[PDB]
């Protein structure tokens, strides 16, 4: 998954677009993984916290 996140470029030409943030705040939201249900349950089993 980190290799997948690394593949996507981090550069936006508008250079300063405001960001969405976590409910705890601070650091911004970087991406969205879209999955199916069994995949979602297995990813939450392997990756906790």
């Amino acid at each position: 998954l980190s290799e997948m996140v690394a593949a996507v470029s981090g550069e936006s030409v508008l250079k300063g677009v405001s960001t969405y943030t976590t409910a705890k705040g601070g650091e911004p939201v970087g991406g969205v993984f879209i999955v199916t249900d069994n995949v979602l349950r297995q990813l939450l089993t392997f990756l906790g916290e």
Binding site: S12, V13, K15
Partner: protein
């Protein structure tokens, strides 16, 4: 997607020791002479 980079901020600068010398183009040659007694 510009990002400006400073020489002093990158950690590579801990290797070199950096002095500003105002007129380098006029300078022809430079030497260092070490004297080591054994």
């Amino acid at each position: 997607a510009i990002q400006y980079v400073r020489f002093l901020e990158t950690a590579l600068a801990v290797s070199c020791v950096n002095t500003e010398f105002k007129d380098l183009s006029r300078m022809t040659d430079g030497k260092i002479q070490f004297r080591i007694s054994v």
